[PDB]
Design a protein around this motif. Structure first.
Motif, short mmCIF file in Angstrom:
data_model
loop_
_atom_site.label_atom_id
_atom_site.label_comp_id
_atom_site.label_asym_id
_atom_site.label_seq_id
_atom_site.Cartn_x
_atom_site.Cartn_y
_atom_site.Cartn_z
N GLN A 9 0.83 -1.19 0.00
CA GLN A 9 0.00 0.00 0.00
C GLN A 9 0.87 1.26 0.00
O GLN A 9 0.61 2.20 -0.74
CB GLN A 9 -0.96 0.00 1.19
CG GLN A 9 -1.87 1.23 1.16
CD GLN A 9 -3.33 0.82 0.92
OE1 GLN A 9 -4.22 1.10 1.71
NE2 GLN A 9 -3.52 0.15 -0.21
N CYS A 13 1.32 4.94 -2.27
CA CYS A 13 1.22 6.18 -1.51
C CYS A 13 2.55 6.92 -1.62
O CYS A 13 2.63 8.11 -1.30
CB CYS A 13 0.83 5.91 -0.05
SG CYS A 13 -0.94 6.15 0.32
N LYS A 54 -2.21 6.88 -12.38
CA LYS A 54 -1.86 8.14 -11.75
C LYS A 54 -0.54 8.65 -12.33
O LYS A 54 0.23 7.88 -12.89
CB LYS A 54 -1.84 7.99 -10.22
CG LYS A 54 -1.24 9.24 -9.56
CD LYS A 54 -2.15 10.45 -9.76
CE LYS A 54 -1.33 11.75 -9.73
NZ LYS A 54 -1.94 12.76 -10.63
N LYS A 116 -6.81 -1.35 -4.34
CA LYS A 116 -7.54 -0.38 -3.55
C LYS A 116 -6.79 0.96 -3.56
O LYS A 116 -7.38 2.01 -3.32
CB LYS A 116 -7.81 -0.92 -2.14
CG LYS A 116 -6.55 -0.81 -1.27
CD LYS A 116 -6.69 0.32 -0.25
CE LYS A 116 -5.98 1.59 -0.74
NZ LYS A 116 -6.96 2.67 -0.98
N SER A 117 -5.50 0.87 -3.86
CA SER A 117 -4.66 2.05 -3.91
C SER A 117 -4.62 2.60 -5.34
O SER A 117 -4.19 3.73 -5.56
CB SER A 117 -3.25 1.75 -3.41
OG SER A 117 -2.84 2.65 -2.39
N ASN A 119 -7.24 3.06 -7.03
CA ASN A 119 -8.40 3.93 -7.14
C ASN A 119 -8.02 5.34 -6.69
O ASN A 119 -8.48 6.32 -7.27
CB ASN A 119 -9.53 3.44 -6.23
CG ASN A 119 -9.90 1.99 -6.54
OD1 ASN A 119 -10.30 1.64 -7.64
ND2 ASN A 119 -9.74 1.16 -5.51
N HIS A 120 -7.17 5.40 -5.67
CA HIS A 120 -6.72 6.68 -5.15
C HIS A 120 -5.87 7.39 -6.20
O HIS A 120 -5.11 6.76 -6.92
CB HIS A 120 -5.99 6.49 -3.82
CG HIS A 120 -4.61 5.88 -3.96
ND1 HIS A 120 -3.70 6.29 -4.92
CD2 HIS A 120 -4.00 4.89 -3.25
CE1 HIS A 120 -2.60 5.58 -4.78
NE2 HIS A 120 -2.78 4.71 -3.75
N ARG A 121 -6.03 8.71 -6.25
CA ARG A 121 -5.29 9.52 -7.20
C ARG A 121 -3.79 9.31 -7.01
O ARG A 121 -3.13 8.70 -7.85
CB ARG A 121 -5.62 11.00 -7.03
CG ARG A 121 -6.49 11.51 -8.18
CD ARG A 121 -5.72 11.47 -9.50
NE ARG A 121 -6.17 12.57 -10.38
CZ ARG A 121 -7.31 12.54 -11.10
NH1 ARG A 121 -8.11 11.47 -11.04
NH2 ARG A 121 -7.64 13.58 -11.87
N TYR A 122 -3.28 9.83 -5.90
CA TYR A 122 -1.87 9.70 -5.59
C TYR A 122 -1.62 9.83 -4.08
O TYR A 122 -1.37 10.93 -3.58
CB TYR A 122 -1.18 10.87 -6.31
CG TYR A 122 0.08 11.38 -5.60
CD1 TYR A 122 1.01 10.49 -5.12
CD2 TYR A 122 0.27 12.74 -5.43
CE1 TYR A 122 2.19 10.97 -4.45
CE2 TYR A 122 1.45 13.22 -4.76
CZ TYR A 122 2.35 12.32 -4.30
OH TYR A 122 3.47 12.77 -3.67
N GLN A 123 -1.70 8.70 -3.41
CA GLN A 123 -1.49 8.67 -1.97
C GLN A 123 -2.59 9.45 -1.25
O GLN A 123 -2.32 10.46 -0.60
CB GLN A 123 -0.11 9.21 -1.61
CG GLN A 123 0.10 9.22 -0.09
CD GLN A 123 0.52 10.61 0.40
OE1 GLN A 123 1.47 11.20 -0.08
NE2 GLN A 123 -0.24 11.09 1.38
N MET A 124 -3.81 8.96 -1.40
CA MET A 124 -4.96 9.60 -0.78
C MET A 124 -4.94 9.40 0.74
O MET A 124 -5.90 8.92 1.32
CB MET A 124 -6.25 9.00 -1.35
CG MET A 124 -6.69 9.76 -2.60
SD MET A 124 -8.05 10.85 -2.21
CE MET A 124 -7.16 12.18 -1.42
N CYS A 126 -3.60 7.31 2.28
CA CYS A 126 -3.71 5.89 2.57
C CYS A 126 -2.72 5.54 3.67
O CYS A 126 -2.14 6.43 4.30
CB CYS A 126 -3.50 5.05 1.31
SG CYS A 126 -1.77 4.53 1.02
#
Length: 127
Positions: A9, A13, A54, A116-117, A119-124, A126
């Motif tokens: 993860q 991030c 990303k 799951k990471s 989906n996050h833009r760039y280290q949401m 997390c």
């Protein structure tokens, strides 16, 4: 560096340019010797760009890594893997930095924590 890839993860991030590009071509660009007298070498990654989770808007059709099977990278040739979301601190646009110790996977591996990471833009934020 024979680093140890982990952070299922903290990899997504830490990165700053996740792209499921495909490295088919490369460029053996010397980088001088290290502190051990050994040759650095930072083979290129003339990918073909297939996806860009990303990172920038253009793409990094030319990534950087280590030679050999993979000493400081994942040494992807596509012909042996396929594609990867290559996600690392990056180096700007049209070129970035990716290493084994850094976040990098053929995508067709992740597991979940990596998805799951994705989906996050760039280290949401997390963890």
């Amino acid at each position: 560096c024979s680093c140890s890839p982990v952070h299922p993860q903290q990899a997504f991030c830490n990165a700053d340019v996740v792209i499921r590009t495909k490295a088919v071509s490369e460029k053996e660009v010397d980088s001088g010797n290290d502190i051990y007298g050994n040759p650095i070498k930072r083979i290129q990654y003339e990918i073909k760009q297939i996806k860009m989770f990303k990172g920038p808007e253009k793409d990094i059709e030319f990534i950087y890594t280590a030679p050999s099977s993979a000493v400081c990278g994942v040494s992807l040739d596509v012909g042996g893997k396929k594609e990867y979301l290559i996600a690392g601190k990056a180096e700007g646009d049209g070129k970035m930095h990716i290493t084994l110790c850094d976040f990098i996977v053929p995508w067709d591996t992740l597991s979940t924590t990596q998805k799951k990471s994705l989906n996050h833009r760039y280290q949401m934020g997390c963890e």
